[PDB]
Amino acid sequence: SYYSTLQCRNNHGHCRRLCFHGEQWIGNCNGRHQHCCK
């Protein structure tokens, strides 16, 4: 599925293994250890 990845997109986040400084871990994208970072 891509639903969670797409929702990261819709939320203006980025799917990352680790969130960058200043970014909040607001969800997960699809895939393994793909975190939605905003």
Numbering used by the authors: 1 to 38
What does the paper say about this structure?
Defensins, a family of cysteine-rich cationic host defence peptides, are a major component of the innate immune systems of all plant and animal species, however crocodilian defensins are poorly characterised. We now report the functional and structural characterisation of Crocodylus porosus β-defensin 13 (CpoBD13). We now show that the saltwater crocodile defensin CpoBD13 harbors potent antifungal activity that is mediated by a pH-dependent membrane-targeting action. CpoBD13 binds the phospholipid phosphatidic acid (PA) to form a large helical oligomeric complex, with specific histidine residues mediating PA binding.
To understand the structural basis of CpoBD13 activity, we determined its atomic structure using X-ray crystallography. A single copy of CpoBD13 was found in the asymmetric unit, with clear and continuous density observed for the entire protein chain. CpoBD13 adopts a fold comprising the family-defining structural elements observed in mammalian β-defensins comprising a single α-helix and a three-stranded β-sheet, which are connected via three disulphide bonds. A Dali analysis of CpoBD13 revealed that human β-defensin-2 (HBD-2) is the closest structural homologue in the Protein Data Bank (PDB), with a rmsd of 0.8 Å (Z-score 6.2) over 40 Cα atoms, and a peptide sequence identity of 26% (only I26 and K38 are conserved in addition to the cysteine residues that form the structurally critical disulphide bonds). An overlay of the two defensin structures revealed that residue H35 of CpoBD13 was located in the same position as the key lipid binding residue K36 in HBD-2. We surmised that if the activity of CpoBD13 is as conserved with HBD-2 as its tertiary structure, the co-localisation of these amino acids could indicate that histidine may play a role in CpoBD13–lipid interactions. Our findings reveal that despite limited primary sequence identity, the three-dimensional structure of CpoBD13 bears a striking resemblance to HBD-2, suggesting strong evolutionary conservation of the β-defensin structure between humans and reptiles.
